[PDB]
Amino acid sequence: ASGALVFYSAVDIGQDWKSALQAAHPGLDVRIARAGDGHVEGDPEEVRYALVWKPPHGFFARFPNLKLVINLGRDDLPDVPVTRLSDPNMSQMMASFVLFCVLRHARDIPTFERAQREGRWHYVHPRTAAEIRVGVLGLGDLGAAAALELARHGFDVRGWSRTPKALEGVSCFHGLEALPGFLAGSEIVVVMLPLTPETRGLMNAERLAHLPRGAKFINVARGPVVDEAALIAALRSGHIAEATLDVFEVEPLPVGSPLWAMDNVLVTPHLASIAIPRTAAPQIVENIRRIEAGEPVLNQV
Amino acid sequence: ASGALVFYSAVDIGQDWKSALQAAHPGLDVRIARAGDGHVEGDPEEVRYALVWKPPHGFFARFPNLKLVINLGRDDLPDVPVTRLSDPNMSQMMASFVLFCVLRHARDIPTFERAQREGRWHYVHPRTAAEIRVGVLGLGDLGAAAALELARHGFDVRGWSRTPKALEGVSCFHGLEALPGFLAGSEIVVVMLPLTPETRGLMNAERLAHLPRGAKFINVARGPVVDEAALIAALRSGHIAEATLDVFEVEPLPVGSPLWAMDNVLVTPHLASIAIPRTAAPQIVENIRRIEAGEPVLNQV
């Protein structure tokens, strides 16, 4: 639209976004910056829009005529509108993913997966859903929807939030003072807290220790709501029996992380909250035109 | 209750049932017959009730004074009432298990599980639920509930039944003539047919070949609704890309089955439809007393 879009992400496939954006706006110039250094071909003065996830330090300084940033979900950030994607179904896709992770632990699937590799038919003691206590940590739009969906499956569902909540069929706890008792009664815990200065590192060693021994831990929020070092330590001591982790302190998860080789951890690479090019491209193309006509942008953060 | 109960199952834990039954009826004599030969200690004339799953040929001939059989879910069967367990929530537990299996395939979890063992961060092309066609084969009480639950997750859900069905949000097909078109448009297929002479071996080589190449196959019905030989063949040719199998022609699944070592198959050992001792024991104890007072038995088959 009289200017180029640059794409950067180490956790998203540039080409799929390029195809979707050029389908939605034929002859839009989309330039994929290289993961790592952010090297991008072409005249950087022509770049007016940036679609990015955690780009390299100094990345935006490459593009003096940038008019619009779009985050794929501040020291060098210019003085321009910043938008996020509004995908009306992410709430659904996230809730469905959480249900998968909760059911996988509640039915002891990790034990069965191990047994199959051993060639053996495993016997476990049957339990009803109602005997399984599942705690959702965070009851914003995403956490509340996941907690309501879990309650449909018969689990003893609890939730925690900083502020009072009333969610039908969910045992809601609130405040920092209630966090130890909330954690102590959660056999399976789902981290779904937005990441702010008050939630950064909230699931530290002290909070992890409030969980019952043998707890099952699911993280779909952000790596650093959770202290990764402390999590690994709890997994090594058997305090947490098993985990499903979709988000990490550094992503892609570095090769040397001890999490990869742990039999009792499932590493998923940002599957819960993935942006979908086909359904997000239209709102990006529309914001390009708005910025170019001096109209306010949709979904500004 | 003036007589002993004998338990037999190769797929259920005798001791858990004994504990639950003796909790519910203190001093009820519960004798666990040994898997394989069915050897059971004690005077067999004192045995009046049998709680069983697929007992050995000739097993019931051991117990001339048998008054009641309870199936844990005919050539030597005596002329007595036969009951099944009525667990009002099996419909829920089954639907929850099907949702787990469908989500596991729809999010390509088997590929990610492989990637973690390789120590690598895998990139897949994102798809909406609405682009994924999921077919439920069988729309009886269990299949209809699973199909309705799947539709809540946004999938393009279809179902098949021998007779017409109207299920809100589900594309329903009916009749044998409709089976090829039903299968050809199902990317993920869930077998949930009850096992009768008309459904035995229905998913044979010819029907499997109607599925699209790369289909994902889930079996939670009964091993022999599906031709196991033909299934293995389709898996080997890549016609079926991956599978989740909870039921088999012979159970426990013999050690030499090729299914155990297949990377693209998850073997689960009868988890979808498992009987729960604590919640089933009361109705068994009540039927013992009814049979002993000459009252009709609950849940007769």
Coordinates of C-alpha atoms in Angstrom, one line a residue:
Chain A
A1 CA 0.0 0.0 0.0
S2 CA 2.6 2.5 -1.2
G3 CA 5.1 0.8 1.2
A4 CA 6.5 -2.5 2.4
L5 CA 5.7 -4.8 5.3
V6 CA 8.5 -6.5 7.1
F7 CA 7.9 -9.7 9.1
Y8 CA 10.0 -11.0 12.0
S9 CA 9.5 -14.1 14.2
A10 CA 11.6 -17.0 15.4
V11 CA 8.4 -18.9 16.4
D12 CA 6.2 -18.3 13.2
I13 CA 6.6 -19.3 9.6
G14 CA 7.3 -16.1 7.5
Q15 CA 6.3 -17.6 4.2
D16 CA 2.8 -18.6 5.3
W17 CA 2.2 -15.1 6.5
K18 CA 3.5 -13.7 3.2
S19 CA 1.1 -15.9 1.2
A20 CA -1.9 -14.9 3.3
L21 CA -1.0 -11.2 3.3
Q22 CA -0.4 -11.1 -0.5
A23 CA -3.6 -13.1 -1.1
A24 CA -5.6 -10.5 0.9
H25 CA -3.7 -7.5 -0.7
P26 CA -2.2 -8.5 -4.1
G27 CA 1.1 -6.7 -4.8
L28 CA 1.6 -5.8 -1.1
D29 CA 5.4 -6.0 -0.7
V30 CA 6.2 -8.4 2.2
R31 CA 9.7 -8.9 3.2
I32 CA 10.7 -11.7 5.6
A33 CA 13.5 -10.7 7.9
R34 CA 15.9 -13.5 8.8
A35 CA 15.6 -15.1 12.3
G36 CA 18.5 -14.2 14.5
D37 CA 20.0 -11.0 13.0
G38 CA 16.9 -9.7 11.3
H39 CA 18.6 -9.2 8.0
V40 CA 16.0 -8.2 5.4
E41 CA 16.7 -7.5 1.7
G42 CA 15.6 -4.3 -0.1
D43 CA 15.5 -0.5 0.7
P44 CA 14.6 -0.2 4.4
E45 CA 13.3 3.3 3.8
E46 CA 10.4 1.7 1.9
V47 CA 9.3 -0.3 5.0
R48 CA 6.3 1.2 6.7
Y49 CA 4.7 -1.7 8.6
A50 CA 6.3 -4.3 10.9
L51 CA 4.6 -7.6 11.9
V52 CA 6.8 -9.1 14.6
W53 CA 7.4 -11.3 17.6
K54 CA 10.2 -10.4 20.0
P55 CA 12.5 -9.0 17.2
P56 CA 16.2 -8.5 17.8
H57 CA 17.5 -5.6 20.0
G58 CA 17.7 -2.6 17.6
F59 CA 15.5 -4.1 14.9
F60 CA 13.1 -1.2 14.6
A61 CA 15.9 1.3 14.1
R62 CA 16.4 -0.2 10.7
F63 CA 13.2 1.4 9.5
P64 CA 13.0 5.2 9.9
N65 CA 9.6 5.5 8.0
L66 CA 7.8 2.8 10.1
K67 CA 4.1 3.9 10.6
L68 CA 2.6 0.8 12.2
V69 CA 3.7 -2.2 14.3
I70 CA 1.6 -5.4 14.6
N71 CA 2.5 -7.8 17.4
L72 CA 2.0 -11.5 16.4
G73 CA -0.4 -12.5 19.2
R74 CA 10.6 -0.6 24.5
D75 CA 14.1 1.0 24.0
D76 CA 14.1 1.2 20.1
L77 CA 10.3 1.3 19.5
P78 CA 9.3 4.4 17.5
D79 CA 6.5 6.7 18.3
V80 CA 3.8 4.9 16.3
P81 CA 0.6 2.8 16.7
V82 CA 1.1 -0.7 18.0
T83 CA -1.6 -3.3 17.4
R84 CA -2.2 -6.8 18.4
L85 CA -4.2 -9.4 16.5
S86 CA -7.8 -9.9 17.5
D87 CA -8.7 -13.4 16.7
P88 CA -12.2 -13.9 18.0
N89 CA -11.6 -17.7 18.4
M90 CA -8.3 -17.8 20.2
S91 CA -10.3 -18.1 23.4
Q92 CA -11.8 -21.4 21.9
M93 CA -8.5 -22.7 20.5
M94 CA -6.9 -22.0 23.9
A95 CA -9.7 -23.7 25.9
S96 CA -9.6 -26.7 23.6
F97 CA -5.8 -27.0 24.0
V98 CA -6.1 -26.7 27.9
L99 CA -8.7 -29.4 27.9
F100 CA -6.4 -31.7 25.9
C101 CA -3.5 -31.0 28.4
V102 CA -5.8 -31.5 31.5
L103 CA -7.3 -34.8 30.1
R104 CA -3.9 -36.1 29.1
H105 CA -2.7 -35.8 32.7
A106 CA -6.0 -36.8 34.4
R107 CA -6.1 -40.1 32.4
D108 CA -2.4 -40.7 33.1
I109 CA -1.5 -40.7 29.3
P110 CA 2.2 -40.1 30.0
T111 CA 2.4 -43.4 31.9
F112 CA 0.6 -45.3 29.1
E113 CA 2.8 -43.7 26.4
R114 CA 5.8 -45.1 28.4
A115 CA 4.2 -48.5 28.8
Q116 CA 3.7 -48.8 25.0
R117 CA 7.4 -48.1 24.4
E118 CA 8.0 -51.0 26.9
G119 CA 5.5 -53.2 25.0
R120 CA 3.4 -53.7 28.1
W121 CA -0.3 -53.4 29.0
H122 CA -0.5 -51.1 32.0
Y123 CA -3.2 -51.3 34.8
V124 CA -4.1 -48.1 36.8
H125 CA -6.7 -47.7 39.5
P126 CA -9.8 -46.1 37.9
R127 CA -10.9 -42.6 39.3
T128 CA -14.0 -40.5 38.4
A129 CA -13.4 -36.9 37.1
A130 CA -15.0 -35.6 40.3
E131 CA -12.2 -36.9 42.4
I132 CA -9.6 -35.0 40.3
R133 CA -9.0 -31.4 41.5
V134 CA -7.9 -29.1 38.6
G135 CA -6.8 -25.5 39.4
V136 CA -6.7 -22.8 36.8
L137 CA -4.3 -20.0 37.8
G138 CA -5.6 -16.8 36.2
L139 CA -9.3 -16.0 35.3
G140 CA -9.1 -13.4 32.7
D141 CA -10.9 -13.9 29.4
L142 CA -8.9 -17.0 28.5
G143 CA -8.6 -18.6 31.9
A144 CA -12.3 -18.1 32.8
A145 CA -13.3 -19.8 29.5
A146 CA -10.9 -22.7 30.1
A147 CA -12.2 -23.1 33.6
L148 CA -15.9 -23.2 32.5
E149 CA -15.1 -25.8 29.8
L150 CA -13.2 -28.0 32.3
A151 CA -16.2 -27.9 34.6
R152 CA -18.3 -29.5 31.9
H153 CA -16.1 -32.5 32.0
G154 CA -17.0 -33.2 35.7
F155 CA -13.7 -32.3 37.3
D156 CA -13.5 -30.6 40.7
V157 CA -12.4 -27.3 39.0
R158 CA -11.0 -24.4 41.0
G159 CA -9.7 -21.1 39.9
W160 CA -7.5 -18.3 41.2
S161 CA -7.5 -14.6 40.4
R162 CA -6.1 -11.5 41.9
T163 CA -9.7 -10.1 42.2
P164 CA -13.2 -11.7 43.1
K165 CA -14.8 -13.9 40.4
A166 CA -18.1 -15.8 40.2
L167 CA -17.9 -18.5 37.6
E168 CA -20.7 -21.1 37.5
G169 CA -19.4 -24.5 38.6
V170 CA -15.9 -23.3 39.5
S171 CA -14.5 -23.0 43.0
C172 CA -13.0 -19.5 42.8
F173 CA -10.2 -18.3 45.1
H174 CA -8.9 -14.8 45.1
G175 CA -6.0 -12.7 46.4
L176 CA -2.3 -13.5 47.1
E177 CA -3.2 -14.6 50.6
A178 CA -5.4 -17.4 49.1
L179 CA -2.7 -18.6 46.7
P180 CA -1.2 -21.2 49.0
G181 CA -4.5 -22.9 49.9
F182 CA -5.5 -22.8 46.2
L183 CA -2.3 -24.5 45.1
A184 CA -2.2 -27.0 48.0
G185 CA -5.6 -28.5 46.8
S186 CA -4.8 -28.6 43.1
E187 CA -3.7 -32.0 41.8
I188 CA -3.4 -30.6 38.2
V189 CA -2.6 -26.9 37.9
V190 CA -3.0 -24.8 34.7
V191 CA -1.0 -21.5 34.5
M192 CA -3.0 -19.0 32.4
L193 CA -1.9 -15.7 34.0
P194 CA -1.3 -12.7 31.8
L195 CA 2.4 -11.5 32.3
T196 CA 2.7 -8.2 34.2
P197 CA 5.2 -6.9 36.8
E198 CA 2.9 -8.4 39.5
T199 CA 2.7 -11.9 37.9
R200 CA 6.3 -12.1 36.6
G201 CA 8.0 -14.9 38.5
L202 CA 4.8 -15.5 40.6
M203 CA 5.2 -19.3 40.3
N204 CA 8.6 -19.3 42.0
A205 CA 10.2 -22.0 44.3
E206 CA 8.0 -21.0 47.3
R207 CA 4.7 -21.2 45.3
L208 CA 5.7 -24.4 43.6
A209 CA 6.3 -26.0 47.0
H210 CA 2.7 -25.3 48.0
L211 CA 1.5 -27.7 45.4
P212 CA 0.9 -31.3 46.6
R213 CA 3.8 -33.7 46.0
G214 CA 3.0 -35.5 42.8
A215 CA 1.2 -32.6 41.2
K216 CA 0.8 -32.2 37.4
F217 CA 1.8 -28.8 35.9
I218 CA 0.6 -27.2 32.7
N219 CA 2.0 -23.8 31.4
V220 CA 0.2 -22.0 28.6
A221 CA 0.7 -18.4 29.7
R222 CA 4.3 -17.1 29.4
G223 CA 7.6 -18.7 30.3
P224 CA 8.5 -16.1 33.0
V225 CA 5.2 -16.2 35.0
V226 CA 7.0 -19.3 36.0
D227 CA 10.5 -19.5 37.4
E228 CA 12.0 -22.0 34.9
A229 CA 14.9 -22.9 37.2
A230 CA 12.6 -23.7 40.1
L231 CA 10.3 -25.7 37.8
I232 CA 13.1 -27.9 36.7
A233 CA 14.2 -28.4 40.3
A234 CA 10.7 -29.5 41.3
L235 CA 10.5 -31.9 38.4
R236 CA 13.9 -33.4 39.3
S237 CA 12.9 -33.9 43.0
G238 CA 9.6 -35.5 42.0
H239 CA 7.6 -32.7 43.7
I240 CA 5.9 -32.2 40.3
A241 CA 5.3 -35.6 38.8
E242 CA 4.8 -34.5 35.2
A243 CA 4.3 -31.4 33.1
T244 CA 3.1 -30.1 29.8
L245 CA 4.9 -26.8 28.8
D246 CA 3.9 -24.7 25.8
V247 CA 5.9 -21.6 26.6
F248 CA 9.5 -21.0 27.9
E249 CA 11.8 -18.4 29.2
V250 CA 13.8 -18.5 25.9
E251 CA 12.0 -19.6 22.6
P252 CA 12.6 -21.6 20.6
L253 CA 13.7 -23.6 23.6
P254 CA 17.5 -23.9 23.5
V255 CA 18.9 -27.3 22.6
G256 CA 20.6 -27.8 26.0
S257 CA 17.5 -27.4 28.1
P258 CA 17.0 -30.4 30.4
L259 CA 13.3 -30.3 29.6
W260 CA 13.7 -31.9 26.2
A261 CA 15.0 -35.2 27.5
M262 CA 12.6 -35.5 30.4
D263 CA 10.3 -38.5 29.9
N264 CA 7.6 -36.9 32.2
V265 CA 7.5 -33.5 30.4
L266 CA 5.7 -32.8 27.1
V267 CA 7.2 -29.8 25.3
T268 CA 4.9 -28.1 22.8
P269 CA 6.1 -25.3 20.8
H270 CA 3.6 -22.4 21.2
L271 CA 0.6 -24.3 20.1
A272 CA -2.0 -23.0 22.5
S273 CA -2.0 -19.4 21.4
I274 CA -0.8 -19.6 17.7
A275 CA -1.7 -16.9 15.3
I276 CA -3.5 -18.1 12.1
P277 CA -2.4 -16.3 8.9
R278 CA -5.6 -16.7 6.9
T279 CA -7.8 -15.3 9.6
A280 CA -5.5 -12.6 10.8
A281 CA -4.2 -11.2 7.4
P282 CA -7.5 -9.2 6.7
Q283 CA -7.3 -7.0 9.8
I284 CA -3.6 -6.3 9.1
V285 CA -4.4 -5.3 5.5
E286 CA -7.3 -3.1 6.8
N287 CA -5.0 -1.4 9.3
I288 CA -2.4 -0.7 6.6
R289 CA -5.1 1.1 4.7
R290 CA -6.3 3.0 7.8
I291 CA -2.8 4.2 8.7
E292 CA -2.4 5.2 5.0
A293 CA -5.7 7.2 5.1
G294 CA -5.1 8.7 8.5
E295 CA -7.9 6.7 10.1
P296 CA -7.6 5.3 13.6
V297 CA -6.3 1.7 13.6
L298 CA -8.3 -1.3 14.9
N299 CA -7.0 -3.2 18.0
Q300 CA -4.5 -0.6 19.2
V301 CA -2.5 -1.6 22.4
Chain B
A1 CA -25.1 -62.6 51.1
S2 CA -25.3 -66.3 52.0
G3 CA -23.0 -67.0 49.0
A4 CA -19.7 -66.0 47.3
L5 CA -18.9 -63.7 44.5
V6 CA -16.3 -64.7 41.9
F7 CA -14.4 -62.1 39.8
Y8 CA -12.7 -62.7 36.5
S9 CA -11.1 -60.2 34.2
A10 CA -7.7 -60.0 32.3
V11 CA -8.3 -56.2 31.8
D12 CA -9.5 -55.1 35.3
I13 CA -7.8 -55.2 38.7
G14 CA -9.5 -57.9 40.9
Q15 CA -8.3 -56.4 44.2
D16 CA -9.8 -53.0 43.7
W17 CA -13.1 -54.6 42.9
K18 CA -12.8 -56.8 46.0
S19 CA -12.1 -53.8 48.2
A20 CA -15.1 -51.8 46.8
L21 CA -17.5 -54.7 47.1
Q22 CA -16.5 -55.6 50.6
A23 CA -16.7 -51.9 51.6
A24 CA -20.3 -51.8 50.2
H25 CA -21.2 -55.2 51.7
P26 CA -18.9 -56.1 54.7
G27 CA -18.3 -59.9 54.9
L28 CA -19.3 -60.5 51.3
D29 CA -17.1 -63.3 50.2
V30 CA -15.3 -62.2 47.0
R31 CA -13.0 -64.6 45.3
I32 CA -10.6 -63.4 42.6
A33 CA -10.2 -66.0 39.8
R34 CA -6.7 -66.1 38.3
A35 CA -6.3 -64.5 34.8
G36 CA -5.7 -67.2 32.1
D37 CA -7.0 -70.5 33.6
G38 CA -9.6 -68.9 36.0
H39 CA -8.3 -70.9 39.0
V40 CA -10.1 -69.7 42.1
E41 CA -9.7 -71.0 45.7
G42 CA -12.5 -72.3 47.9
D43 CA -15.6 -74.5 47.5
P44 CA -17.1 -73.6 44.1
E45 CA -20.6 -74.8 45.2
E46 CA -20.6 -71.7 47.4
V47 CA -20.2 -69.3 44.5
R48 CA -23.5 -67.7 43.5
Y49 CA -22.5 -64.5 41.7
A50 CA -20.0 -63.9 38.9
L51 CA -18.6 -60.5 37.9
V52 CA -16.7 -61.1 34.7
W53 CA -15.1 -59.9 31.5
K54 CA -14.6 -62.5 28.7
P55 CA -13.8 -65.4 31.1
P56 CA -12.1 -68.6 29.9
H57 CA -14.1 -71.1 27.8
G58 CA -15.9 -73.4 30.3
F59 CA -15.5 -70.9 33.2
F60 CA -19.1 -70.9 34.3
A61 CA -19.3 -74.7 34.4
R62 CA -17.2 -74.5 37.6
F63 CA -20.2 -73.0 39.5
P64 CA -23.3 -75.1 39.5
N65 CA -25.2 -72.8 42.0
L66 CA -24.6 -69.5 40.1
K67 CA -27.7 -67.3 40.3
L68 CA -26.4 -64.0 38.8
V69 CA -23.9 -62.9 36.2
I70 CA -22.6 -59.3 36.0
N71 CA -20.7 -58.2 32.9
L72 CA -17.9 -55.7 33.6
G73 CA -19.1 -53.0 31.2
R74 CA -22.9 -68.3 25.1
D75 CA -22.0 -72.1 25.1
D76 CA -21.4 -72.6 28.9
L77 CA -23.6 -69.8 30.2
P78 CA -26.3 -71.0 32.6
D79 CA -30.0 -70.2 32.6
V80 CA -29.7 -67.1 34.9
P81 CA -30.0 -63.3 34.9
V82 CA -27.2 -61.4 33.2
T83 CA -26.6 -57.8 34.1
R84 CA -24.4 -55.0 32.8
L85 CA -23.2 -52.1 34.8
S86 CA -25.1 -48.8 34.5
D87 CA -22.7 -46.0 35.2
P88 CA -24.6 -42.9 34.5
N89 CA -21.4 -41.0 33.6
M90 CA -19.7 -43.4 31.2
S91 CA -21.2 -41.3 28.5
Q92 CA -19.2 -38.3 29.9
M93 CA -16.0 -40.2 30.5
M94 CA -16.2 -41.6 27.0
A95 CA -16.9 -38.2 25.4
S96 CA -14.1 -36.6 27.3
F97 CA -11.7 -39.4 26.2
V98 CA -12.8 -39.0 22.5
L99 CA -12.2 -35.2 22.7
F100 CA -8.7 -35.9 24.0
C101 CA -8.0 -38.3 21.1
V102 CA -9.5 -36.0 18.5
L103 CA -7.6 -32.9 19.8
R104 CA -4.3 -34.9 20.1
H105 CA -4.6 -35.7 16.3
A106 CA -6.0 -32.3 15.2
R107 CA -3.1 -30.4 16.9
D108 CA -0.6 -32.9 15.4
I109 CA 0.6 -33.9 18.9
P110 CA 2.3 -37.2 17.7
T111 CA 4.6 -35.1 15.4
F112 CA 5.5 -32.8 18.4
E113 CA 6.1 -35.8 20.7
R114 CA 8.6 -37.1 18.1
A115 CA 10.2 -33.7 17.7
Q116 CA 10.8 -33.5 21.5
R117 CA 12.6 -36.8 21.5
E118 CA 14.8 -35.4 18.6
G119 CA 15.4 -32.2 20.7
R120 CA 13.9 -30.0 18.1
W121 CA 11.4 -27.2 17.9
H122 CA 8.9 -28.1 15.2
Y123 CA 7.0 -25.6 12.9
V124 CA 3.6 -26.6 11.5
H125 CA 1.2 -24.7 9.3
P126 CA -1.6 -23.3 11.6
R127 CA -5.2 -24.4 10.8
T128 CA -8.6 -23.4 12.4
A129 CA -10.8 -26.1 13.9
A130 CA -13.4 -25.4 11.2
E131 CA -11.0 -26.6 8.5
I132 CA -10.7 -30.0 10.2
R133 CA -13.3 -32.6 9.3
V134 CA -14.0 -35.1 12.1
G135 CA -16.3 -38.1 11.4
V136 CA -17.9 -40.1 14.3
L137 CA -18.9 -43.6 13.1
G138 CA -21.9 -44.7 15.2
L139 CA -24.5 -42.3 16.8
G140 CA -26.0 -44.3 19.6
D141 CA -26.0 -42.8 23.1
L142 CA -22.2 -42.7 23.3
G143 CA -21.5 -41.6 19.7
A144 CA -24.1 -38.9 19.7
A145 CA -22.8 -37.4 22.9
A146 CA -19.2 -37.4 21.6
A147 CA -20.3 -35.9 18.3
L148 CA -22.2 -33.0 20.1
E149 CA -19.2 -32.3 22.3
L150 CA -16.8 -32.2 19.4
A151 CA -19.0 -29.7 17.6
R152 CA -18.6 -27.3 20.6
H153 CA -14.9 -27.2 19.8
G154 CA -15.6 -25.7 16.3
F155 CA -14.6 -28.8 14.2
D156 CA -16.5 -29.6 11.0
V157 CA -18.2 -32.6 12.7
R158 CA -19.9 -35.3 10.7
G159 CA -21.6 -38.5 12.0
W160 CA -22.7 -41.8 10.5
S161 CA -25.5 -44.1 11.6
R162 CA -27.4 -46.9 10.2
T163 CA -30.7 -44.9 10.7
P164 CA -31.6 -41.2 10.3
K165 CA -30.3 -38.8 13.0
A166 CA -30.8 -35.1 13.7
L167 CA -28.0 -33.8 16.0
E168 CA -27.6 -30.0 16.3
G169 CA -24.4 -28.8 14.7
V170 CA -23.4 -32.3 13.3
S171 CA -23.5 -33.2 9.6
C172 CA -25.3 -36.6 9.9
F173 CA -25.1 -39.3 7.2
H174 CA -27.0 -42.5 7.3
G175 CA -27.2 -45.9 5.6
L176 CA -24.6 -48.3 4.2
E177 CA -24.8 -46.5 0.8
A178 CA -23.7 -43.2 2.5
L179 CA -20.7 -44.8 4.2
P180 CA -18.2 -44.3 1.4
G181 CA -18.9 -40.5 1.0
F182 CA -19.0 -40.2 4.9
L183 CA -15.5 -41.7 5.2
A184 CA -14.0 -40.0 2.1
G185 CA -14.6 -36.5 3.7
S186 CA -13.4 -37.5 7.2
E187 CA -9.8 -36.4 8.0
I188 CA -10.1 -37.8 11.5
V189 CA -12.4 -40.7 12.1
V190 CA -13.7 -42.0 15.5
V191 CA -15.1 -45.6 15.6
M192 CA -17.9 -45.7 18.2
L193 CA -20.2 -48.4 16.7
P194 CA -21.7 -51.0 19.0
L195 CA -20.5 -54.5 18.0
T196 CA -23.3 -56.6 16.4
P197 CA -23.4 -59.1 13.5
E198 CA -24.1 -56.2 11.1
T199 CA -21.2 -54.0 12.4
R200 CA -18.7 -56.8 13.0
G201 CA -15.8 -56.3 10.5
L202 CA -17.6 -53.2 9.0
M203 CA -14.3 -51.3 9.0
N204 CA -12.6 -53.8 6.6
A205 CA -10.0 -53.1 3.9
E206 CA -12.6 -51.8 1.4
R207 CA -14.0 -49.2 3.9
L208 CA -10.6 -48.2 5.2
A209 CA -9.6 -47.5 1.6
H210 CA -12.5 -44.9 1.3
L211 CA -10.8 -42.7 3.9
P212 CA -8.6 -40.0 2.4
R213 CA -4.9 -40.8 2.3
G214 CA -3.3 -39.4 5.4
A215 CA -6.4 -39.9 7.6
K216 CA -6.2 -40.2 11.3
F217 CA -8.0 -43.2 12.9
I218 CA -9.3 -43.5 16.5
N219 CA -11.0 -46.8 17.8
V220 CA -12.9 -46.7 21.1
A221 CA -15.7 -49.2 20.2
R222 CA -14.5 -52.9 20.0
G223 CA -11.5 -54.4 18.3
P224 CA -13.5 -56.5 15.8
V225 CA -15.8 -53.6 14.4
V226 CA -12.4 -53.0 12.8
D227 CA -10.5 -55.6 10.8
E228 CA -7.2 -55.4 12.7
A229 CA -5.1 -57.0 9.8
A230 CA -6.5 -54.4 7.4
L231 CA -5.8 -51.6 9.8
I232 CA -2.2 -52.6 10.2
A233 CA -1.8 -52.8 6.4
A234 CA -3.2 -49.3 6.0
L235 CA -0.9 -47.9 8.6
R236 CA 2.1 -49.6 6.9
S237 CA 1.3 -48.2 3.5
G238 CA 0.7 -44.7 4.9
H239 CA -2.9 -44.7 3.9
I240 CA -3.7 -44.0 7.6
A241 CA -1.1 -41.5 8.9
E242 CA -1.7 -42.1 12.6
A243 CA -4.0 -43.8 15.0
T244 CA -5.1 -44.0 18.6
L245 CA -6.5 -47.5 19.5
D246 CA -8.1 -48.2 22.9
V247 CA -9.6 -51.7 22.0
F248 CA -8.1 -54.7 20.1
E249 CA -9.1 -58.0 18.7
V250 CA -7.2 -59.8 21.5
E251 CA -6.8 -58.1 25.0
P252 CA -4.4 -57.5 26.6
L253 CA -2.8 -56.9 23.2
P254 CA -0.3 -59.6 22.7
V255 CA 3.4 -58.8 23.0
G256 CA 4.1 -59.6 19.3
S257 CA 1.6 -57.2 17.8
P258 CA 3.2 -54.7 15.4
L259 CA 1.1 -51.9 16.9
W260 CA 3.2 -51.6 20.0
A261 CA 6.4 -50.4 18.2
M262 CA 4.6 -48.1 15.7
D263 CA 5.7 -44.5 16.4
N264 CA 2.5 -43.2 14.8
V265 CA 0.1 -45.3 16.9
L266 CA -0.9 -44.6 20.5
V267 CA -2.1 -47.8 22.3
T268 CA -4.3 -47.2 25.2
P269 CA -5.4 -50.2 27.3
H270 CA -9.2 -49.9 27.6
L271 CA -9.3 -46.4 29.1
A272 CA -12.3 -45.0 27.3
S273 CA -14.9 -47.3 28.8
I274 CA -13.4 -48.4 32.1
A275 CA -15.7 -49.6 34.9
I276 CA -15.1 -47.8 38.3
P277 CA -15.3 -50.0 41.3
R278 CA -16.4 -47.4 43.8
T279 CA -19.4 -46.2 41.7
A280 CA -20.4 -49.7 40.3
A281 CA -20.1 -51.8 43.6
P282 CA -23.4 -50.5 45.1
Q283 CA -25.6 -51.7 42.2
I284 CA -23.9 -55.1 42.3
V285 CA -24.5 -55.5 46.0
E286 CA -28.2 -54.4 45.5
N287 CA -28.6 -57.0 42.7
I288 CA -27.2 -59.7 45.0
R289 CA -29.8 -58.9 47.6
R290 CA -32.6 -58.8 44.9
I291 CA -31.6 -62.2 43.5
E292 CA -31.5 -63.5 47.1
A293 CA -35.0 -62.1 47.8
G294 CA -36.5 -63.2 44.5
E295 CA -36.9 -59.6 43.3
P296 CA -36.2 -58.7 39.7
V297 CA -32.6 -57.5 39.1
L298 CA -31.7 -54.0 38.0
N299 CA -30.0 -53.5 34.5
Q300 CA -30.8 -57.0 33.0
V301 CA -29.4 -57.6 29.5

